[PDB]
Design a protein around this motif. Structure first.
Motif, PDB file in Angstrom:
ATOM      1  N   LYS A  57      45.154  23.080  34.949  1.00 55.52           N
ATOM      2  CA  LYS A  57      45.691  21.994  35.760  1.00 55.52           C
ATOM      3  C   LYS A  57      46.606  22.542  36.849  1.00 55.52           C
ATOM      4  O   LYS A  57      47.572  23.247  36.560  1.00 55.52           O
ATOM      5  CB  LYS A  57      46.468  21.017  34.871  1.00 55.52           C
ATOM      6  N   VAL A  58      46.300  22.216  38.100  1.00 55.38           N
ATOM      7  CA  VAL A  58      47.120  22.691  39.215  1.00 55.38           C
ATOM      8  C   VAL A  58      48.443  21.920  39.246  1.00 55.38           C
ATOM      9  O   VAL A  58      48.535  20.800  38.746  1.00 55.38           O
ATOM     10  CB  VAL A  58      46.375  22.534  40.580  1.00 55.38           C
ATOM     11  N   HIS A  59      49.456  22.534  39.846  1.00 54.83           N
ATOM     12  CA  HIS A  59      50.778  21.925  39.963  1.00 54.83           C
ATOM     13  C   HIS A  59      51.342  22.262  41.343  1.00 54.83           C
ATOM     14  O   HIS A  59      51.533  23.434  41.670  1.00 54.83           O
ATOM     15  CB  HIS A  59      51.683  22.457  38.820  1.00 54.83           C
ATOM     16  N   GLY A  87      49.545  24.994  42.966  1.00 54.82           N
ATOM     17  CA  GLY A  87      49.947  26.048  42.034  1.00 54.82           C
ATOM     18  C   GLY A  87      48.955  26.142  40.882  1.00 54.82           C
ATOM     19  O   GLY A  87      48.870  25.244  40.046  1.00 54.82           O
ATOM     20  N   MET A  88      48.190  27.227  40.852  1.00 57.44           N
ATOM     21  CA  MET A  88      47.188  27.417  39.812  1.00 57.44           C
ATOM     22  C   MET A  88      47.827  27.915  38.518  1.00 57.44           C
ATOM     23  O   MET A  88      47.905  29.118  38.272  1.00 57.44           O
ATOM     24  CB  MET A  88      46.136  28.418  40.299  1.00 57.44           C
ATOM     25  N   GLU A  89      48.275  26.969  37.691  1.00 59.92           N
ATOM     26  CA  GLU A  89      48.904  27.296  36.407  1.00 59.92           C
ATOM     27  C   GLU A  89      47.972  26.926  35.256  1.00 59.92           C
ATOM     28  O   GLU A  89      47.702  25.748  35.020  1.00 59.92           O
ATOM     29  CB  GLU A  89      50.219  26.527  36.266  1.00 59.92           C
ATOM     30  N   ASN A 129      45.558  33.686  39.372  1.00 61.97           N
ATOM     31  CA  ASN A 129      45.410  33.860  40.809  1.00 61.97           C
ATOM     32  C   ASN A 129      44.041  33.390  41.278  1.00 61.97           C
ATOM     33  O   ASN A 129      43.078  34.158  41.286  1.00 61.97           O
ATOM     34  CB  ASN A 129      45.594  35.328  41.191  1.00 61.97           C
ATOM     35  N   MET A 130      43.963  32.127  41.687  1.00 60.66           N
ATOM     36  CA  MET A 130      42.710  31.562  42.180  1.00 60.66           C
ATOM     37  C   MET A 130      42.639  31.771  43.707  1.00 60.66           C
ATOM     38  O   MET A 130      43.585  31.420  44.411  1.00 60.66           O
ATOM     39  CB  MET A 130      42.665  30.065  41.826  1.00 60.66           C
ATOM     40  N   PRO A 131      41.571  32.337  44.242  1.00 57.56           N
ATOM     41  CA  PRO A 131      41.470  32.573  45.714  1.00 57.56           C
ATOM     42  C   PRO A 131      41.323  31.268  46.497  1.00 57.56           C
ATOM     43  O   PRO A 131      40.486  30.426  46.175  1.00 57.56           O
ATOM     44  CB  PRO A 131      40.229  33.468  45.861  1.00 57.56           C
ATOM     45  N   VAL A 162      37.293  25.465  45.459  1.00 59.44           N
ATOM     46  CA  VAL A 162      37.297  24.030  45.185  1.00 59.44           C
ATOM     47  C   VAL A 162      37.480  23.741  43.698  1.00 59.44           C
ATOM     48  O   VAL A 162      36.692  24.193  42.868  1.00 59.44           O
ATOM     49  CB  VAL A 162      35.982  23.411  45.661  1.00 59.44           C
ATOM     50  N   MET A 163      38.512  22.956  43.370  1.00 63.79           N
ATOM     51  CA  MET A 163      38.774  22.577  41.983  1.00 63.79           C
ATOM     52  C   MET A 163      38.396  21.110  41.808  1.00 63.79           C
ATOM     53  O   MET A 163      38.672  20.289  42.683  1.00 63.79           O
ATOM     54  CB  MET A 163      40.260  22.770  41.632  1.00 63.79           C
ATOM     55  N   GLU A 164      37.744  20.781  40.692  1.00 58.89           N
ATOM     56  CA  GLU A 164      37.314  19.398  40.438  1.00 58.89           C
ATOM     57  C   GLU A 164      37.969  18.844  39.179  1.00 58.89           C
ATOM     58  O   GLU A 164      37.824  19.406  38.093  1.00 58.89           O
ATOM     59  CB  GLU A 164      35.793  19.355  40.275  1.00 58.89           C
ATOM     60  N   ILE A 190      41.135  21.210  46.730  1.00 67.60           N
ATOM     61  CA  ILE A 190      41.002  22.628  47.058  1.00 67.60           C
ATOM     62  C   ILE A 190      42.305  23.371  46.804  1.00 67.60           C
ATOM     63  O   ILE A 190      43.389  22.848  47.057  1.00 67.60           O
ATOM     64  CB  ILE A 190      40.604  22.786  48.527  1.00 67.60           C
ATOM     65  N   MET A 191      42.190  24.602  46.312  1.00 74.73           N
ATOM     66  CA  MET A 191      43.368  25.414  46.038  1.00 74.73           C
ATOM     67  C   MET A 191      44.084  25.739  47.346  1.00 74.73           C
ATOM     68  O   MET A 191      43.897  26.812  47.918  1.00 74.73           O
ATOM     69  CB  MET A 191      42.961  26.708  45.316  1.00 74.73           C
ATOM     70  N   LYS A 192      44.905  24.803  47.809  1.00 80.56           N
ATOM     71  CA  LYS A 192      45.649  24.996  49.048  1.00 80.56           C
ATOM     72  C   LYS A 192      46.699  26.082  48.866  1.00 80.56           C
ATOM     73  O   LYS A 192      46.614  27.157  49.459  1.00 80.56           O
ATOM     74  CB  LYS A 192      46.345  23.686  49.448  1.00 80.56           C
TER      75      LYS A 192
HETATM   76 CU   LIG Z   1      43.242  26.387  41.763  1.00 82.43          CU
END
Ligand SMILES: [Cu+]
Ligand SMILES: [Cu+2]
Length: 74
Positions: free
Chosen positions: A17-19, A27-29, A37-39, A43-45, A53-55
């Motif tokens: 779950k992103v934060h 924040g890819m936690e 570390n997601m590049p 795209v996260m769904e 998207i992992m901004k």
């Molecule tokens: Cu992500």
């Protein structure tokens, strides 16, 4: 602080779950109590099918912080 007020959690399909922070950055936690570390662009769904998207690929934020003025100089 007002940090308590800020909150964001998108239930990813990968169980994670992103934060996002105050800078709107993501924040890819991972739910494993760790970071991943997601590049940027990966795209996260969400379960609801919400395209996010992992901004904020700058997960470094999670790892401690300089404790900004949490107000001025946003
Ligand atoms: Cu992500
Ligand atoms: Cu504050």
């Amino acid at each position: 602080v007002d940090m308590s007020n800020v909150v964001k959690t998108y239930d990813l399909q990968d169980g994670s779950k992103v934060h996002v922070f105050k800078d709107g950055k993501m924040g890819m936690e991972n739910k494993f109590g760790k970071s991943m570390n997601m590049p940027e662009g990966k795209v996260m769904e969400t379960r609801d099918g919400t395209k996010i998207i992992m901004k904020g690929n700058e997960i470094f934020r999670l790892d401690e912080a300089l404790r900004k003025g949490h107000s001025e100089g946003g």
